[PDB]
């Protein structure tokens, strides 16, 4: 649904409601859907424009006061219906561009205050080498583990804990002090995970493959390895398990958990892989 | 400067008191055997 800049203000103002209208067919008809509003601030720009050319009086930042009732109408149409209304769903993934990282503004504040989570993105992390540049401290999801597979819960709890510790300690660590091994292990594992969570553009991965990779990263098959080598460790392991161990992936996709059998099989596969391959450490 | 100072402080305190907690965990059960489940 393209409401571009040459397209008039009312079309830019109507496009997200049109998208929600197209998605309510799925939501009501027992099907599922996802809707991505891109440049949700241009909607508010267009509403400001309309009200100011209709001589309506402004508020703060020259916006009207009905911006909350502009976004609430729109985002309250996303919903998960019951088993009597079909069982459908409409997920929402709004997008917002801040200026100088100022999230103390009006529109960012409203939309953060009316959403079930946040995914912050930073330029410091985008240029340091972390791509996607997601800050996992500020980023949250109130739903959380309930929207997560058990196989992914098992790994991601430990991952979040380790990354919290690493984020706490790394700033002090970077000053050239000399630390014990219990802390050097924290730094090593945090660097490994930070180098694991990087991804190329238009290169998404399945859930089972994410599970396997984060297993390799969490059980310590990347701590001694060099940080710069993980970008090829990842791809070689992906190719290996996609070629010779699709059955493990199918089992994870079906059962949606990690039994001890799959645990042992995955560990054996990783051991075979490290045997067959060689890296800088 | 702000996040800089805060994170440096947090890391230093964490390391220091991690060491101290390790030491206290070493020397606890001797000086307080009434908690030691070895004698229970």
């Amino acid at each position: 649904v393209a409401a571009t800049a040459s397209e008039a203000a009312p079309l830019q103002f109507l496009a997200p409601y049109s998208g929600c209208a197209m998605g309510e067919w799925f939501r009501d008809s027992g099907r599922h859907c996802v809707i991505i509003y891109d440049d949700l601030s241009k909607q508010a720009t267009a509403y400001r424009q309309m009200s100011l050319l209709l001589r309506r009086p402004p508020g703060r930042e020259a916006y009207p006061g009905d911006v909350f009732y502009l976004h609430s109408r729109l985002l309250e149409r996303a919903a998960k219906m019951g088993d009597k209304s079909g069982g459908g769903s409409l997920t929402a993934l709004p997008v917002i561009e801040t200026q100088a990282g100022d999230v103390s503004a009006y529109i960012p504040t409203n939309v953060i205050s009316i959403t079930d989570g946040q995914i912050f993105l930073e330029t410091e992390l985008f240029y340091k080498g972390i791509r996607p540049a997601i800050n996992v401290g500020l980023s949250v999801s109130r739903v959380g583990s309930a929207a997560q597979v058990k196989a992914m819960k098992q790994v991601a709890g430990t991952m979040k804990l380790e990354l919290a510790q690493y984020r706490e300690v790394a700033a002090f660590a970077q000053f050239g002090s000399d630390l014990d091994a219990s802390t050097r292990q924290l730094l090593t594992r945090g660097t490994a995970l930070t180098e694991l969570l990087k991804q190329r553009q238009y290169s998404p991965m399945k859930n089972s493959v994410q599970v396997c990779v984060l297993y390799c990263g969490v059980k310590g098959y990347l701590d001694p390895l060099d940080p710069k080598e993980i970008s090829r460790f990842e791809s070689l392991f992906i190719d290996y398990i996609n070629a010779n161990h699709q059955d493990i992936l199918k089992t994870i996709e079906t059962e949606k958990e990690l039994s001890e059998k799959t645990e042992a099989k995955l560990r054996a596969a990783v051991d075979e892989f490290v045997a067959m391959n060689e890296f800088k450490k | 400067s702000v996040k800089f100072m805060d994170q440096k402080r947090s890391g230093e305190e964490t390391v220091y008191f991690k060491k101290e907690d390790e030491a206290l965990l070493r020397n606890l059960l001797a000086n307080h055997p009434e908690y030691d489940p070895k004698y229970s």
Binding site: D102, S104 | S1, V2, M5
Partner: peptide, 12 residues
């Protein structure tokens, strides 16, 4: 902004 400059002045 203001909060940034005020916090910086306090810290310095």
């Amino acid at each position: 902004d203001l909060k940034i400059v005020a916090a910086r002045m306090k810290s310095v």
